[PDB]
Amino acid sequence: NPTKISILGRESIIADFGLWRNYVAKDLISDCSSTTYVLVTDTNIGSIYTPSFEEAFRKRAAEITPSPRLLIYNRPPGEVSKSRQTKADIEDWMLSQNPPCGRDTVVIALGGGVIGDLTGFVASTYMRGVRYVQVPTTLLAMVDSSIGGKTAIDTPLGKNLIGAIWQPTKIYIDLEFLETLPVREFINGMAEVIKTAAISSEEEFTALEENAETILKAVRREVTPGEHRFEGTEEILKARILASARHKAYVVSADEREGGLRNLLNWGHSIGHAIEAILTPQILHGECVAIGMVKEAELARHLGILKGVAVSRIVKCLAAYGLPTSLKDARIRKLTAGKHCSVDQLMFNMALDKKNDGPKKKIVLLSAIGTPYETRASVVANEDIRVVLA
Amino acid sequence: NPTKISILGRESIIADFGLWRNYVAKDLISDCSSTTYVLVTDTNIGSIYTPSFEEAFRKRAAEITPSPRLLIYNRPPGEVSKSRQTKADIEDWMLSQNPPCGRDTVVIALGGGVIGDLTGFVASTYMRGVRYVQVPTTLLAMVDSSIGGKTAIDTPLGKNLIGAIWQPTKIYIDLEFLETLPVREFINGMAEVIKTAAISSEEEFTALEENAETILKAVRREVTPGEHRFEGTEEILKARILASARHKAYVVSADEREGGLRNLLNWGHSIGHAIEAILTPQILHGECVAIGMVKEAELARHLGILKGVAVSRIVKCLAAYGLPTSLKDARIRKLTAGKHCSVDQLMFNMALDKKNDGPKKKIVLLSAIGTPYETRASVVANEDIRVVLA
Numbered sequence: 130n131p132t133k134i135s136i137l138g139r140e141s142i143i144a145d146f147g148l149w150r151n152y153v154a155k156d157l158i159s160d161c162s163s164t165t166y167v168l169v170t171d172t173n174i175g176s177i178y179t180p181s182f183e184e185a186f187r188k189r190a191a192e193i194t195p196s197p198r199l200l201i202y203n204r205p206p207g208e209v210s211k212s213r214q215t216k217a218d219i220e221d222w223m224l225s226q227n228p229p230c231g232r233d234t235v236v237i238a239l240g241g242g243v244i245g246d247l248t249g250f251v252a253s254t255y256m257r258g259v260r261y262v263q264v265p266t267t268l269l270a271m272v273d274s275s276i277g278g279k280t281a282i283d284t285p286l287g288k289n290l291i292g293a294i295w296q297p298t299k300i301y302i303d304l305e306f307l308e309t310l311p312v313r314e315f316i317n318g319m320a321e322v323i324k325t326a327a328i329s330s331e332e333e334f335t336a337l338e339e340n341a342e343t344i345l346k347a348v349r350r351e352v353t354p355g356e357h358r359f360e361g362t363e364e365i366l367k368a369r370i371l372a373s374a375r376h377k378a379y380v381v382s383a384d385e386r387e388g389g390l391r392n393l394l395n396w397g398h399s400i401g402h403a404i405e406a407i408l409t410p411q412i413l414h415g416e417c418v419a420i421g422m423v424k425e426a427e428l429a430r431h432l433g434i435l436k437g438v439a440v441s442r443i444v445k446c447l448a449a450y451g452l453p454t455s456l457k458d459a460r461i462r463k464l465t466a467g468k469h470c471s472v473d474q475l476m477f478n479m480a481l482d483k484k485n486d487g488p489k490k491k492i493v494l495l496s497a498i499g500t501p502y503e504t505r506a507s508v509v510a511n512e513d514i515r516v517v518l519a
Numbered sequence: 520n521p522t523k524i525s526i527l528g529r530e531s532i533i534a535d536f537g538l539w540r541n542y543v544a545k546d547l548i549s550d551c552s553s554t555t556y557v558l559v560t561d562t563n564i565g566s567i568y569t570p571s572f573e574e575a576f577r578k579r580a581a582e583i584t585p586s587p588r589l590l591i592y593n594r595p596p597g598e599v600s601k602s603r604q605t606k607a608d609i610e611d612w613m614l615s616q617n618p619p620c621g622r623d624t625v626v627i628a629l630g631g632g633v634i635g636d637l638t639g640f641v642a643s644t645y646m647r648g649v650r651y652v653q654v655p656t657t658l659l660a661m662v663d664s665s666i667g668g669k670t671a672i673d674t675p676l677g678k679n680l681i682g683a684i685w686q687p688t689k690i691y692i693d694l695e696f697l698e699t700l701p702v703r704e705f706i707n708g709m710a711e712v713i714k715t716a717a718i719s720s721e722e723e724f725t726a727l728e729e730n731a732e733t734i735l736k737a738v739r740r741e742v743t744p745g746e747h748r749f750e751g752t753e754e755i756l757k758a759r760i761l762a763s764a765r766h767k768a769y770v771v772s773a774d775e776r777e778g779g780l781r782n783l784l785n786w787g788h789s790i791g792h793a794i795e796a797i798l799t800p801q802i803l804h805g806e807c808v809a810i811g812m813v814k815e816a817e818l819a820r821h822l823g824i825l826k827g828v829a830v831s832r833i834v835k836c837l838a839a840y841g842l843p844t845s846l847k848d849a850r851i852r853k854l855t856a857g858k859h860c861s862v863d864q865l866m867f868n869m870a871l872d873k874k875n876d877g878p879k880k881k882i883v884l885l886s887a888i889g890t891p892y893e894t895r896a897s898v899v900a901n902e903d904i905r906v907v908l909a
């Protein structure tokens with residue numbers, strides 16, 4: 130049946146196959162009663178999933194009277210969509226409706242982290258606040274980006290510098306979206322799953338190690354007209370996803386506004402974001418996170434917290450999934466046409482890390498696979514950060 | 520002594536004379552411990568009050584070690600400062616510091632509602648959230664705009680359409696700022712004081728009627744080198760201000776996110792903002808609110824809720840203060856060079872009112888001076904709104 134998970138004192142998370150088709154529209158109209166619904170997505174995703182949804186919506190809004198309206202917004206692909214410019218356009222668009230979208234509006238985010246963050250933020254400030262639901266269409270979004278309530282946009286100086294923490298009213302993890310998820314996006318998302326396990330369960334980490342091959346091959350294996358990309362390994366997949374979703378719910382519920390515990394969910398992101406700011410959009414987020422976790426593991430070991438054995442073990446599991454494990458990686462080179470990451474440019478970007486307490490940089494340190502050094506980010510001197518950035 | 524008022528379960532409001540001089544800097548460093556303080560203000564206010572403050576700050580940060588830093592930001596005058604452009608610049612500026620401003624930052628808003636809303640908003644989204652304190656320098660800000668936590672910016676389509684509700688950690692009502700407040704700004708602010716009384720206390724309303732002359736004359740009376748613009752009427756003034764501040768605290772505390780009760784604080788703003796969107800920046804906010812309250816009173820009476828007697832009584836008290844009571848007002852004409860407000864343009868703007876439940880416009884209706892018709896905005900048909908816009 131539909132697996133449900135509670136977050137911040139509430140059953141907002143609902144995962145299962147084909148929710149988009151027969152559930153969302155129904156649930157929206159009952160639980161999220163409103164007169165105006167706005168669906169935000171991009172051109173790729175949209176032309177595939179909005180058509181059938183418009184129908185399921187119309188079917189359900191026939192119940193109501195006066196019947197509610199679903200407005201649809203479609204825009205350009207990539208991380209380019211996460212800017213002040215873009216957020217403004219969605220807003221100008223909403224206000225310019227007839228009538229304009231009021232505080233009753235219910236925004237629907239249908240995409241990965243870009244459409245999720247953008248949409249979540251647009252809602253947090255729209256007339257000071259309107260509800261929205263997350264409809265993750267990418268593995269990375271189902272396991273991490275659509276949960277937590279964290280939203281933002283990017284500025285020329287770094288990742289997610291401006292934004293807000295606005296909790297979504299509903300989160301629909303429709304595994305069925307993975308059926309069309311490109312191979313890279315899948316491996317890309319896989320980084321967050323491994324991350325969550327590496328800071329929570331050693332068992333879950335091992336389980337991820339063992340599933341590496343089976344999964345990665347089902348993702349590359351070509352799929353025929355009438356079967357599922359995840360035949361055979363359907364539950365295994367649901368277990369890996371739920372595991373990460375559930376733990377984030379646990380971490381977010383206990384420290385929603387990142388006062389302490391929520392720092393942990395940022396393992397690999399301190400160096401990761403520093404990298405990303407320089408390699409994006411050529412290098413995806415999950416890709417930059419893998420390299421980040423390895424660099425952070427190395428530092429943990431450098432400081433005597435982590436074990437050499439655990440560090441190399443992290444590496445293996447990442448590479449097992451097709452994730453890059455070093456800024457030197459071949460493709461990371463062919464893709465990053467030119468671009469390079471000096472320790473200076475990196476250190477500079479890490480100065481903009483949203484965890485730094487004042488000038489004291491803070492990074493998540495692992496003492497062993499599935500066990501954090503502290504229940505918060507550890508203050509790490511700049512010289513130490515520099516060495517592990519060889 | 521320093522009069523303190525609690526809001527949203529907390530003594531964040533502190534009012535008295537000369538707080539800016541000897542208190543703020545001291546209080547900031549103790550209660551608002553931080554390593555980075557950012558003072559936002561404009562050129563007028565700034566060149567007068569920041570110099571002495573830098574000193575009181577330096578005096579207090581000598582205590583601490585490493586000593587914290589106060590960064591100062593100065594920009595253009597008017598409502599022009601309330602835009603996405605401007606908010607972005609303050610942000611780009613903060614991030615571009617050395618080191619950049621982190622989540623520990625403590626933003627200090629030193630200005631009227633423009634510097635207050637802008638600053639409050641910049642803080643609500645800065646790295647998803649940083650603290651800030653309000654330092655109202657205008658009567659309208661001390662009585663209304665710096666309290667509540669409501670912040671925003673304006674877009675080409677209307678007033679405060681984008682923003683957030685971010686509560687300030689401290690609010691410093693330093694009456695001493697009124698010593699230099701231009702006459703118009705004072706009358707301008709006076710509208711909010713009368714509004715708050717008209718939806719709360721009939722006594723307080725009468726008290727405002729009686730003080731009209733005394734106050735208005737002390738505001739016009741020229742002041743000599745060694746005296747106070749408010750000699751003689753010092754307490755009377757403190758009573759009128761506190762009265763409004765306290766009641767907003769009561770209303771905001773009970774319905775922070777405007778789910779019901781907080782609508783009341785928007786009396787005169789439904790038609791008021793609709794006007795404002797068209798007459799600004801030539802016509803101040805308080806000015807547009809006076810006209811709004813009168814038009815809303817007329818509608819209340821039109822609908823049988825309010826009494827003719829009460830309506831004209833509202834008018835008298837407003838005009839008593841120098842506030843305009845009709846879109847026809849002479850100066851409102853000479854100032855609004857050209858501009859006019861058809862019922863269509865107005866009705867259009869009222870479609871963008873952040874109270875409208877769906878398409879159902881909602882306006883605050885008074886049944887008698889100091890007594891609301893409901894503890895929320897009343898849904899008013901469009902045809903009725905049109906008649907009272909003759």
Ligand SMILES: NC(=O)c1ccc[n+]([C@@H]2O[C@H](COP(=O)([O-])OP(=O)(O)OC[C@H]3O[C@@H](n4cnc5c(N)ncnc54)[C@H](O)[C@@H]3O)[C@@H](O)[C@H]2O)c1
Pocket residue numbers: 171173174206207208211240241242243244245246266267269270273274275276277278279280281288289306307309310311314317413414
């Ligand atoms: N705020 C948070 O909670 C949070 C958490 C994690 C990561 N992030 C952010 O997430 C962003 C990246 O997320 P992402 O990888 O989801 O990126 P994304 O939203 O850019 O999606 C990646 C690609 O997937 C395509 N796609 C979407 N769903 C598909 C489907 N069903 N089948 C086929 N193609 C599909 C899109 O067209 C797009 O090209 C980064 O900006 C990162 O900082 C934010």
Ligand SMILES: NC(=O)c1ccc[n+]([C@@H]2O[C@H](COP(=O)([O-])OP(=O)(O)OC[C@H]3O[C@@H](n4cnc5c(N)ncnc54)[C@H](O)[C@@H]3O)[C@@H](O)[C@H]2O)c1
Pocket residue numbers: 561563564596597598601630631632633634635636656657659660663664665666667668669670671678679696697699700701704707803804
């Ligand atoms: N979000 C809220 O809670 C809220 C509540 C009320 C009104 N408002 C908003 O407030 C804004 C207008 O507020 P305002 O009237 O304070 O405007 P403002 O901030 O533009 O200030 C008006 C003028 O006062 C001058 N000034 C400031 N303090 C002074 C002093 N001590 N002596 C001399 N000159 C001084 C400034 O240079 C400026 O020209 C509007 O945009 C309105 O929508 C918002």
Ligand SMILES: O=C(O)[C@]1(O)C[C@H](CP(=O)(O)O)[C@@H](O)[C@H](O)C1
Pocket residue numbers: 273276277279281288289321391392394395398402483
């Ligand atoms: O708390 C969270 O949800 C995160 O730390 C949020 C970050 C984004 P942030 O560093 O901008 O907060 C995300 O990339 C990470 O995977 C999980």
Ligand SMILES: O=C(O)[C@]1(O)C[C@H](CP(=O)(O)O)[C@@H](O)[C@H](O)C1
Pocket residue numbers: 663666667669671678679711781782784785788792873
């Ligand atoms: O709740 C409030 O604080 C207000 O309603 C907030 C409004 C601004 P808003 O209509 O943009 O919310 C302000 O002008 C009014 O004086 C009081």
Ligand SMILES: [Cl-]
Pocket residue numbers: 232256257258259776777
């Ligand atoms: Cl709201």
Ligand SMILES: [Cl-]
Pocket residue numbers: 311312313
């Ligand atoms: Cl592919």
Ligand SMILES: [Cl-]
Pocket residue numbers: 386387622646647648649
């Ligand atoms: Cl924060």
Ligand SMILES: [Cl-]
Pocket residue numbers: 701702703
């Ligand atoms: Cl003057």
Ligand SMILES: [Zn+2]
Pocket residue numbers: 273321398414418
């Ligand atoms: Zn991430």
Ligand SMILES: [Zn+2]
Pocket residue numbers: 663711788804808
């Ligand atoms: Zn106002």
